[model samples]
Target chain A: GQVQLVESGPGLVAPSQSLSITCTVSGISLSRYNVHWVRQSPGKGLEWLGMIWGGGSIEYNPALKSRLSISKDNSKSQIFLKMNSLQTDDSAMYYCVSYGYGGDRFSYWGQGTLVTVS
Target chain B: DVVMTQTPSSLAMSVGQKVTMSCKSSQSLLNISNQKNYLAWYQQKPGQSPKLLVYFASTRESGVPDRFIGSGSGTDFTLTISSVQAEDQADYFCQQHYRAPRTFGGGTKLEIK
Candidate 1:
C-alpha cells in the first residue's frame, strides 16, 4: 500500500502542557488498522513509544507509560497521539503507522512530527 | 507486554563477508494454519525514514536484495546477509505485527564487516 507523510511542528514547547499530532494514510482499512507511535532523538535510533488498536485497546512502552496515549476517530480517518506533562527530555520526532496483523511489523509509515519540550 | 530478543546487539564485519542477526519473540507468533507469523524487519539508516526490509516474517520487501534473507517460525527468526556491504551499515530491527505496542526488537547495529 502507498503511504503519505503528515508532519507537525518543531519548536520549544513548554513543560507540563499537552502534545498532540496526527497521521493520515491512504489505501488501507482504517477501522481494522492499528496505529503506532514511535520516536527518535536528534541522532539516536528509533524508539518504540506505543500504539493503539482499532478497538481502543492500548499499550505503551514500560518506560513511557504514564506520559503517552494513542487514539483515533475512524470517522475522520485520522489517528492521534498525545503525551502529557511533557519534560525537556520529551523532545523527539513522533510518528504514526497504520498496521494490521500488528505483531512483527508495520511495513508502512507516515512522514512524522517533530515535537520538542522545553 | 511482548518482549522481543535480538542477538549480537552490535556487530562489525568487513564488506563481502556475511553478517547475521537474530530475533525471537516472547510468544509464539504463529496462527493455527502456520500460514503467518506476522513477523517483519526494518532498516533505519542515518538521516532518513525507516525502510521496510522484510515482512510476513520472512518475505523480503520490494526491491530489497536477494542477499538479504529472512527465515524463521513461531517465536524465533533470523536475518542473514549473504554478502555484507558497507551500504548496509545501519540499525536493523525486528517487529511482530500480531501484537501491540506492535513490538520491535531492541535493534542490531550493523557495521561494515
Candidate 2:
C-alpha cells in the first residue's frame, strides 16, 4: 500500500475539554476500509484505543468507550479522533493503524503524534 | 486479558551475532480451525511507530529481510535474527491477537555493542 499517515492537531490541551486530532491518509480510500487509533505511554505497551470499521462503525476499548469517538471523512480520506474529559494520563504517543479486515495484524502505521494534556 | 511477556529486558550484541528474543503469552494463541498462532512481532526504533516484522508466528511481513525469523507455537514464541546489524538496534515487541483487548509485551530493547 502507498498510504501515508500524517497526524495533525494541537499538541497541548486542557484537562477537561474536548480534544480532536486528525489523521490524513493518502494513496488509499477510506470509504470502505478500517483505521485504528493506538497509543503508547512513557512506560506502557501499545494500547488499542479504538477502531473504525469499513462500514464506519467504531469499536473502542471499554475503558475509554465513554470518552472516545472515531469517525472518518471519506471524501477526504481522513480519520478523526475526538476524545472528551481528557486527563493527564491520556498524554502519550498516538498512532493510526490499518490491518485490513477481520482484525488482522497491523500492517501499516501512522507516524505517531505526541499529545500532552495539561 | 492475555498477558504477553518478553524476556531479557535488554540485550547488547555486535554485528553478525545471532540474537534471540522470547515472548510468552498467558494462554494458548493457536486457533484450532486454522491451526495458526495469532502472535506477531514488531520492531520500533526511537521516535518511530512500530513496524510489523512477523505474523502468524513464523510468517515474515512483506519486504522484511529473510535474516529475521519467527518461530514457536502455543503460548511460547521466539523472534530470531540470524545476524544482527547496527540498524537492527531497536525495541521489539510481541502481541497476541487471540482474543479481545489485544495485548502486547513490555518489549525488549536491543542495543549495538
Candidate 3:
C-alpha cells in the first residue's frame, strides 16, 4: 500500500547525445512487478516506450527498438532507461509505471522527469 | 502497432450534462481466450500524471467514480461521464494493450461550464 516511484535524470541534453533516466521504486520488490517507460510530448498524448518484466525480460516499441534499452537492478529496486541518438522529437516528460504480473492495469506511477533535447 | 483514434478532440459541457467520447482502434483488441477487450482509459489533469479510470473495457479501476463508465468491444469503445463536474475537467485517453508497443489515442480534452 506504500507503492511509490520516482524518476530522475538530466533535464537537458544536446541532440545526438544519449539520454539516461532512472526509476527508483519503493514498497515493492522489482522481482514482483513489471516496470514500463512511458512518455508524453508537449501537448501530445501518452506513448508507451517499453517494459522490463520482473524476470529480466525486456520489450521495446518497434520504432525505438534500435535506440532504446530498458534494464533493471533488483537489488536496488531501480529501473533504467537509456536511449541513443537523442533528438528534438525525444523531448518530453518520461514516467515509469508498475504493473502487477496478473493485475488488470498499471497501478503505480512515477512522478516523471522532463527531458529536453536541443 | 495498433492505432487509436479518439473523437471530439475537445468538448465543454455544463454541470449535470452527460459527456461521452469515442475511441476506435485500427485492430481488434478482443483477446479470445480471456473474452475481454485489452483496453483501458485514463484521466490526466494539467501538470499531473495519468490515472487509470477503467480497464478491460468496462471495469472501472478501484476508487474511480461511478459516474465514469466505459463500454465497448473489438475495435470500438466509449467513455462516458454521467454527470459533469468542475473537477472532471481534464484530458482523457484510451489505450490498447492488445499487443506489444501499446498504443494510445490522441486524447480528448474536457472543460466544465
Residue lDDT tens for model 2, B1-113: 68889988999999999999999999999999999999989999988789999999998887789999999999999999999989999999998877766778999999977
Off by over 4 Å in 1: A26-33, A42-69, A73-77, A100-106, B33-35
Consecutive 10-residue window with the lowest summed lDDT within model 3 chain B? B54-63
Comparing to the true complex, what docking class would candidate 3 get?
medium
Fnat of each prediction, in sequence = 0.30, 0.50, 0.63
In order of lDDT, best first, we have 3, 2, 1
Model 3 backbone overlap count = 0
User: Which candidate leads the pack in TM-score?
Assistant: 3
Better of 1 and 3 by lDDT: 3
Q: What overall lDDT goes with each candidate model?
A: 0.77, 0.86, 0.91
Model 3 chain A: weakest 10-residue lDDT segment is A100-109
Tell me the tens digit of each residue's lDDT in model 3 across A25-79.
9888889898999999866658899999889899999999999999999999999
TM-score of 3: 0.95
Classified by CAPRI criteria, candidate 2 counts as acceptable
Task: Report candidate 3's fraction of native contacts.
Answer: 0.63
Model 3 residue pairs with clashes: none
Clashes (candidate 1): 18
